[PDB]
């Protein structure tokens, strides 16, 4: 009786002076919008139904129509920016925020979902949602002694919505908004539902993607340990965002980086650096490059965990992108590491795989590598081993590639090449 209705019929009824007729019509709208494929969002919008739906949200006396219209608006906002804008333009935000206090959980759940889709669109709406005061009503929904007493799906919806209020960067969420949210976030990050866990990590990964002051307010809550732990999770949906947070945190101050190391992060990398899911491998190597780009005692930490061998491996065989992250990890290592350390690196077999990479069709990596070689020679120059090093690079045909690059087009390249040639060979 509310299945497959035509847009005009939905209009016909929503316009009647019959509450019940409207309810039936609003529900029919919901079903159209909740259909498997091609929900007639633009058709419903053109019919001018949003204002009507928004107004139904406030019909306290008829919770049923509140729900239906909520669900309907929710799906419209789930669309394009263009469409989401329509919902916002209709006054949906304040109304949805009002529903968070509803006595009907499935209704405030919808409101949660709805606000989730709106802040999702981006910075602008994200901040408008905050300005209408959504954060408190939301957080209030989690003010319970034990998160597990809440309906699983309901808890997931809130988590997801909260994560969206942490998302986007130009600009980043308002500092006080982040400060306000973080506490609940930390608590959610210790829940047993993999879903909640994944989105909790995403939220954190978002907050840690920015300036050091941002990273700090996160690290300041002492969640790094928990992240390192989730970093070891067996579910890829959790591991991915966790590795993102850790990877971001290590782009900050060395003190912040130290935190993840102290947390045991490194012990998981042998696994991560050989992980089957290509992308996890790229993130892992990228993270490693931001660790090798730090304090020597930190580089040493990498060395003690036997991660160099893995870096050699990654450099030797992996997706090119992962190799590019490896190139950096290496170059950064040789850029700030001790002599003894730059030596160990060569002893692990860094030279061959590193040379083979010079054949890569990418001027940028070619620089990072020559750059890296430079650093290595200089360490070998301090041990009068420059010649011996030359042989190696010559043994695996590296020199045969440096003189070729010498005749490369990019300036940075041919120049770096020549220097090496004359200064360390011919």
């Amino acid at each position: 009786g509310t299945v497959n209705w035509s847009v005009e019929d939905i209009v016909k009824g929503i316009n009647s002076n019959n509450l019940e007729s409207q309810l039936q019509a609003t529900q029919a709208a919901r079903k159209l919008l909740s259909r498997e494929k091609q929900p007639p969002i633009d058709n419903i919008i053109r019919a001018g139904l949003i204002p009507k739906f928004v107004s139904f949200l406030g019909k306290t006396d008829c919770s049923p129509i509140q729900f239906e219209s909520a669900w309907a608006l929710t799906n419209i906002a789930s669309g394009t920016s263009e469409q989401t804008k329509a919902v916002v333009d209709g006054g949906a935000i304040p109304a949805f925020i009002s529903l968070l206090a509803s006595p009907h959980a499935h209704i405030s759940e919808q409101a949660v979902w709805a606000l989730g889709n709106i802040a999702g669109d981006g910075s602008a709406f994200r901040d408008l949602v905050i300005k209408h005061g959504a954060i408190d009503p939301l957080l209030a929904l989690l003010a319970v002694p034990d998160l597990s007493t809440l309906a699983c799906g309901y808890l997931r919806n809130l988590t997801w919505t909260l994560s969206n209020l942490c998302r986007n960067k130009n600009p980043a969420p308002p500092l006080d908004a982040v400060e306000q949210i973080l506490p609940t976030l930390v608590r959610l990050l210790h829940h047993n539902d993999p879903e909640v866990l994944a989105d909790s990590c995403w939220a954190i990964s978002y907050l840690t993607d920015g300036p050091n002051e941002r990273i700090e307010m996160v690290v300041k809550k002492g969640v790094v340990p928990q992240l390192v732990k989730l970093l070891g999770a067996t579910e890829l949906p959790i591991v991915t965002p966790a590795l993102r947070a850790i990877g971001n945190i290590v782009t900050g101050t060395d003190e912040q980086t130290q935190k993840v190391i102290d947390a045991g992060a490194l012990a998981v990398f042998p696994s991560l650096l050989t992980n089957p899911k290509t992308n996890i491998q790229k993130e892992a190597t990228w993270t490693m490059s931001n660790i090798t780009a730090g304090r020597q005692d930190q580089i040493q930490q990498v060395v003690n965990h036997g991660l160099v061998p893995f870096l050699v491996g990654v450099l030797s065989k992996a997706d090119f992108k992962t190799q590019k992250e490896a190139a950096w990890a290496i170059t950064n290592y040789t850029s700030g590491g001790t002599v003894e350390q730059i030596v160990y690196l060569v002893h692990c077999g860094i030279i061959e795989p590193l040379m083979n990479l010079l054949s890569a069709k990418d001027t940028k990596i070619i620089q990072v590598i020559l750059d890296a070689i430079s650093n290595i020679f200089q360490a070998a120059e301090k041990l009068g081993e420059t010649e011996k090093l030359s042989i190696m690079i010559e043994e695996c045909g590296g020199l045969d590639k440096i003189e070729a690059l010498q005749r490369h087009e990019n300036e940075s390249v041919y120049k770096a090449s020549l220097n090496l040639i004359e200064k360390y060979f011919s």
Binding site: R35, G116, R167, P241
Partner: peptide, 9 residues
């Protein structure tokens, strides 16, 4: 990354 919006189906 889990994407921006979700449609209740």
């Amino acid at each position: 990354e889990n994407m921006l919006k979700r449609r209740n189906v």
